[PDB]
């Protein structure tokens with residue numbers, strides 16, 4: 001799988017488990033079309049979102065449903081979600097890991113792009 | 116201003132200057148409507164986007180045009196932009212500072228909310 | 231001041247107030263010697279640690295006492311402190327802002343260096 | 346192994362490979378004693394630092410040699426290194442992952458503590 005999402009919780013020092021993640025791809029008319037989705041595992045990871053065949057060059061949006069995550073833990077958060085928007089390019093390496101570190105009023109994200 | 120945006124460059128260790136910022140607000144029909152825009156100053160700050168009168172309750176999206184920033188510096192970065200989505204003023208009027216720290220393959224953002 | 235420290239709390243979305251900060255400077259014998267200390271204000275800022283005259287070339291360590299901060303708020307955090315170590319003024323005198331963003335199991339830090 | 350270190354590069358969007366990491370444990374006389382060390386792998390990870398038998402409760406310091414890493418890449422960095430200082434507690438879960446995200450003028454670190 002060429003696309004993986006990993007989510008960490010900076011308050012508890014743990015994987016962020018059971019977080020909903022929605023991936024979109026931008027359509028010709030400039031709208032976001034649903035592409036893949038799931039919930040993070042006990043390791044904070046979401047695998048199997050797509051295949052090499054389906055993950056063509058394009059503009060993608062990964063939406064991590066952070067507000068619902070903080071609410072489930074009884075903590076008041078700021079963001080509705082975290083959105084990571086990027087162009088997938090075949091020149092670049094094959095595997096994209098989108099990592100996100102969550103706090104109630106802050107998030108960080110990085111891309112780890114490897115072969 | 117009840118809404119301020121501050122952007123730092125983690126590669127240079129400097130304010131991120133001349134970064135375009137676009138703010139949108141969700142309309143009743145759930146579409147994003149333009150609300151305000153501007154560019155960061157030599158201090159990395161963008162003041163004067165709105166007024167207490169105009170900054171009513173709503174769901175807002177602050178997009179920071181990070182790709183345009185990096186490309187102007189000869190870096191082909193990963194993200195298209197950094198996008199901060201939040202409900203504002205739902206518990207009464209507040210002052211919001213959206214701070215962002217940029218690297219070519221990573222960003223963070225935090226909100227500082229005061230009375 | 232040529233050296234300023236600013237600290238934010240990523241859980242509350244606020245300045246981190248009353249955070250103790252200790253600055254050390256390496257001596258010729260490679261031991262850390264006390265250089266300056268203070269506490270962050272209601273704005274999360276600590277000004278006036280030193281002067282241009284006293285802030286000579288050297289290797290400095292800014293320790294931010296994050297454990298004491300969190301414990302005062304009922305959180306048992308992971309780190310003892312956040313420690314920022316750098317050479318200063320080696321390319322001529324500069325102004326340094328050390329910014330830190332705190333969560334109970336995570337911190338970040340960035341330097342903004344200006345003329 | 347109850348202690349693992351993972352290091353990422355926020356400029357290249359890659360694991361930070363061949364980074365020296367030194368771990369210390371605080372001695373009774375309040376000095377730092379060498380405990381374990383290594384260099385990160387091609388995956389940015391350093392495994393096998395210690396065993397459960399040797400990793401007793403105590404205060405530990407993980408020092409990630411970031412300056413040497415940036416110099417090897419021809420980039421001018423700010424920090425001498427990144428230091429992560431923490432108390433290991435047997436009440437807490439068994440496995441400590443120290444993760445660090447590096448930029449030339451900024452670093453972030455989080456602890457992921459799991460069973």
Ligand SMILES: COc1cc(/C=C/c2ccc(O)cc2)cc(OC)c1
Pocket residue numbers: 006008097099100101108109110112338351353442444445446453454455
């Ligand atoms: C296996 O542990 C990991 C930790 C991390 C940590 C990421 C992170 C991102 C932003 C930050 O501010 C701090 C850490 C990323 C990973 O990507 C495969 C794996």
